[PDB]
Design a protein around this ligand. Sequence first.
Ligand SMILES: *[C@@H]1O[C@H](CO)[C@@H](O[C@@H]2O[C@H](CO)[C@@H](O)[C@H](O)[C@H]2NC(C)=O)[C@H](O)[C@H]1NC(C)=O
Ligand SMILES: *[C@@H]1O[C@H](CO)[C@@H](O[C@@H]2O[C@H](CO)[C@@H](O)[C@H](O)[C@H]2NC(C)=O)[C@H](O)[C@H]1NC(C)=O
Ligand SMILES: *[C@@H]1O[C@H](CO)[C@@H](O[C@@H]2O[C@H](CO)[C@@H](O)[C@H](O)[C@H]2NC(C)=O)[C@H](O)[C@H]1NC(C)=O
Ligand SMILES: *[C@@H]1O[C@H](CO)[C@@H](O[C@@H]2O[C@H](CO)[C@@H](O)[C@H](O)[C@H]2NC(C)=O)[C@H](O)[C@H]1NC(C)=O
Ligand SMILES: *[C@@H]1O[C@H](CO)[C@@H](O[C@@H]2O[C@H](CO)[C@@H](O)[C@H](O)[C@H]2NC(C)=O)[C@H](O)[C@H]1NC(C)=O
Ligand code: NAG
Ligand code: NAG
Ligand code: NAG
Lengths: 221, 345, 245
Amino acid sequence: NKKFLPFQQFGRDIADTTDAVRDPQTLEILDITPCSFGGVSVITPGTNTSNQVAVLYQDVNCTWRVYSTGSNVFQTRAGCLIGAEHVNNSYECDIPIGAGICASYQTSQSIIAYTMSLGAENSVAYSNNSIAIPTNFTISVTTEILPVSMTKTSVDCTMYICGDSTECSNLLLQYGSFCTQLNRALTGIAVEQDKNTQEVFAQVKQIYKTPPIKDFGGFNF
Amino acid sequence: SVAYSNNSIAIPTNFTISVTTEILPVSMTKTSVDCTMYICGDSTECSNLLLQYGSFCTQLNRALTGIAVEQDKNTQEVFAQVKQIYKTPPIKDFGGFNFSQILPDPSKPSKRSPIEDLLFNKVTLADAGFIKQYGDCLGDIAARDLICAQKFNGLTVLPPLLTDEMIAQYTSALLAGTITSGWTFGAGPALQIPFPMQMAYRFNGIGVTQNVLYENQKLIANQFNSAIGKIQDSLSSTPSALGKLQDVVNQNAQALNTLVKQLSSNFGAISSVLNDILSRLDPPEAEVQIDRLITGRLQSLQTYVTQQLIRAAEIRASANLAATKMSECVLGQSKRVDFCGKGYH
Amino acid sequence: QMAYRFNGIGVTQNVLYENQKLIANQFNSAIGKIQDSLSSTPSALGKLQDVVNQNAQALNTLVKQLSSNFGAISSVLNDILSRLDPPEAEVQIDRLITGRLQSLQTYVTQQLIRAAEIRASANLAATKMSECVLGQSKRVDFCGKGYHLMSFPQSAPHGVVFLHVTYVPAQEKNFTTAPAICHDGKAHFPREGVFVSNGTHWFVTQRNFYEPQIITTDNTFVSGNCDVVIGIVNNTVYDPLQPEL
Ligand SMILES: *[C@@H]1O[C@H](CO)[C@@H](O[C@@H]2O[C@H](CO)[C@@H](O)[C@H](O)[C@H]2NC(C)=O)[C@H](O)[C@H]1NC(C)=O
Ligand SMILES: *[C@@H]1O[C@H](CO)[C@@H](O[C@@H]2O[C@H](CO)[C@@H](O)[C@H](O)[C@H]2NC(C)=O)[C@H](O)[C@H]1NC(C)=O
Ligand SMILES: *[C@@H]1O[C@H](CO)[C@@H](O[C@@H]2O[C@H](CO)[C@@H](O)[C@H](O)[C@H]2NC(C)=O)[C@H](O)[C@H]1NC(C)=O
Ligand SMILES: *[C@@H]1O[C@H](CO)[C@@H](O[C@@H]2O[C@H](CO)[C@@H](O)[C@H](O)[C@H]2NC(C)=O)[C@H](O)[C@H]1NC(C)=O
Ligand SMILES: *[C@@H]1O[C@H](CO)[C@@H](O[C@@H]2O[C@H](CO)[C@@H](O)[C@H](O)[C@H]2NC(C)=O)[C@H](O)[C@H]1NC(C)=O
Ligand SMILES: *[C@@H]1O[C@H](CO)[C@@H](O)[C@H](O)[C@H]1NC(C)=O
Ligand SMILES: *[C@@H]1O[C@H](CO)[C@@H](O)[C@H](O)[C@H]1NC(C)=O
Ligand SMILES: *[C@@H]1O[C@H](CO)[C@@H](O)[C@H](O)[C@H]1NC(C)=O
């Protein structure tokens, strides 16, 4: 629908690519559009488990620009899923697809697709004069795992870039400060790792020793 | 100026029940990048030259995949704290306290609360969905759609794992659990208690005897209801209330559009157009110019991924703060000053 | 000490002293199950393993990126220097130098971002050490699921493991409750607990463990008359002084 001025032959977009052209024989304006379009994801279990896959076409509404069509075609809000059988049950999420849809390899085995379950349904018996009070208790022990430090690294720039080459080293002498800056950043990281470990573990400065008699009223450590 | 004296004390004779809002970003948009489409779009010569670089987009896509997984992890950590979808009772008699502006509305298909409906209307996303077909980008060339330009240059937006309906379900479960059981469902089984008795427990928590609550129950319920209504009025009136969430959306859109606009950079080559270079030059000088363009566009992608990583670190800090606030202000009563609003929580 | 922590989570210490053997057995059994759980699952130490794997992958990616030509005729310094004189060679060497310097800069930038994330994790771990190991925390879910009693640290490669010991209520029972009790034209409120009824008789118990007691004047306090409290229930409040007279 573009109307070119008579001195114009090509049209360009914001990315400076030619998206419109005037045909030189019949002086009509033609839009130019790239052929390739649309995100593609592949869904697999382990290759040690099976070689079956499911392919998600993120910009295809199957209700085609697909590689192949199988017996199982399921349309999600994350795209058109091909190769997975849709079931009506809700499970926990195994392989996340997106928009509330997950995938799994279940039982004569195939890839299934389902809506993820958020949890078990519950209803509290609320009343304006009723209370629930526990009669017992459970002593529970749970684990929490937190990273504290990572590995400290150092880099020889001349060894990495110009390994045992004098001509390369002499040409690399024109940069210098960039490698000093990289090693400054890595040295800061390396000092920070030991600081992290000290701040987590060296809180108390008295090395307390446990008593030799381990009678703690029945509690055992 | 405080009227200090060595034998004078000031003691309040009344109180106001105040409700205030705190808005925290939790997740940002998940993106994926095709290097071959962005740098060498439908050019086989450029693709064969980009094979010599190769692993840098594997590194970039590893970083972007880590960000995209972290966004769903952030949303799960904030909202899926309890794996028990509690339901509100059908009889909404809570001693005069009314939660209709925060409880789900069954007359809507989204099953959102009125306040949540106002918030979802007041944050404008950059897309009405996540499926933009090739046909409607081909048939709407004259509109010059920014999403169509991004997707033709290999930039796609991945949908979140949890939909807004599932997030509203988690929020409704947390609200129902709080209203019916106090802080007990965040520590074990949900133990029911009448809501005035629960409010008396909170009053004892902030150091006020519970007879104050029981003797001013109607006034306290009226103050709570009025403050909840004023929250709706203030959010619907102020246009810059959801500025943090809108800034997250705008920053992601601006970064993708900057990536699209940077394809016009010559980077020291004779042209920024691969087809214009390949139409005029033989493969040697074409290789020189295309290598310049490849280095420049790879630098643009690396800059985008680095800034996305820094923004994702900031968003992860905000999501950790939101998860901590959910645990310590929704699932319990907090003694920490100003952690859960101004005043005694 | 564990009775002090029970007092911290709002349970009277006689509950602990009367169930000490059961509490010690439950604690020993849970600590014993921790070892079995960690040995049974293989993805327990996934965070520490991902830290190690990410650092190894970054170094190996740096090693593999030396095969990139970066627009030069070869990625091999010796192959360039064997075929070309120094002026023609210097262009290719400069291309390789720019590309490899970019690779090192990318590695250092990603290491800085990862170090910021690890620093946030270590600050959280130090806070958890101070607030869960060196004290008893009132913050919900900061030191495990349930009402926090105490925590124990354990050293791990590139990290720390906390064993949070919590109190989880169990075996709840329905009761009829009331906000206040009217005895002599006065409203009576519980000092520390909650009024409950088993169907016929009214008691007062602590809120986190069922221990019913006779509603006395020592158990309650008086505020006002019986006309303002919604849901006040008629029952007798036993004064212990008057039987002694
Ligand atoms: C895929 O295409 C179908 C068919 O056009 C879309 O379904 C329509 O959706 C609109 C909007 O909700 C409804 O008004 C129509 O009644 C629907 N038609 C049918 C036949 O179902 C569907 O929404 C598209 N999917 C996506 C993700 O956009
Ligand atoms: C409170 O719970 C504990 C453990 O959950 C109960 O102790 C168990 O009691 C049964 C029946 O007497 C025994 O077979 C188990 O061996 C006991 N387990 C332990 C670890 O001691 C206890 O009976 C419960 N008490 C009440 C009043 O319900
Ligand atoms: C404590 O404050 C409340 C609210 O500010 C007061 O309630 C108001 O009282 C006036 C005068 O009787 C009424 O006109 C208003 O309608 C009341 N507001 C509400 C929300 O009920 C209350 O009187 C104050 N009490 C004391 C002892 O000062
Ligand atoms: C509620 O509790 C009261 C007091 O514990 C119970 O009354 C006692 O019941 C036992 C067994 O029937 C008798 O031996 C006592 O003499 C009763 N004491 C009094 C003061 O009456 C009562 O049975 C309980 N009711 C229910 C339904 O459990
Ligand atoms: C609680 O006890 C009081 C006192 O016995 C009851 O008040 C009596 O109510 C009746 C009926 O209205 C009157 O005829 C009496 O004169 C009242 N007596 C006094 C001293 O006020 C009250 O009704 C009882 N409440 C319940 C719920 O049983
Ligand atoms: C070019 O020639 C064709 C016939 O081959 C004719 O139809 C067309 O109009 C011509 N275009 C001009 C003269 O611009
Ligand atoms: C309390 O009563 C309700 C019914 O009103 C019931 O659903 C619930 O299981 C009861 N709680 C118990 C027995 O702990
Ligand atoms: C509880 O609800 C019942 C049923 O409507 C009512 O008769 C009673 O007065 C209510 N009690 C309180 C304290 O609200």
